[PDB]
Amino acid sequence: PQAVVVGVMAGEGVQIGVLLDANAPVSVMTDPLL
Amino acid sequence: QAVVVGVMAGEGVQIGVLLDANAPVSVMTDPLL
Numbered sequence A: 001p002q003a004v005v006v007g008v009m010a011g012e013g014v015q016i017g018v019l020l021d022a023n024a025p026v027s028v029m030t031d032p033l034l
Numbered sequence B: 001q002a003v004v005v006g007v008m009a010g011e012g013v014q015i016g017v018l019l020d021a022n023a024p025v026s027v028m029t030d031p032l033l
Helices: B024-033
Strands: A003-009 A013-023 B002-008 B014-020
Touching: A013 B014
Parallel strands: none
Antiparallel strands: A003 A013, B002 B014
């Protein structure tokens, strides 16, 4: 339950599978994710 | 030489730590824990 795998869409259409932290707040992840 | 980074921990708690620049991760991941 500590993490969840999800697909993230990026510029012009590339889908990438990522394993994200399930409890940190989303604003903490958007910078390193970019 | 050194670097400072935000190390995330349990339930997502944000923590700040100072690490060496040239030593490899394997020799520092033990004391960091």
